[PDB]
Amino acid sequence: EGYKCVXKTCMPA
């Protein structure tokens, strides 16, 4: 999976 982020916020891709 890894992550997706906008600025400082990251959640599972």
Work out what residue 11 binds among a copy of itself, ligand V1J, none; the CB cut-off runs from 5 to 8 Å by kind: a copy of itself
8 A C-beta contact, residue 13 and residue 5: no
Distance CA 13, CA 6 (A): 12
Residue 12 beta carbon to ligand V1J: minimum distance, rounded to whole angstroms:
10
Residue 7 beta carbon to a copy of itself: minimum distance, rounded to whole angstroms:
4
The footprint of ligand V1J on this chain (CB under 6 A) covers a number of residues equal to: 4
Distance CA 11, CA 7 (A): 11
Q: Indicate the length of the chain as a whole number.
A: 13
4 binds ligand V1J (CB under 6 A): no
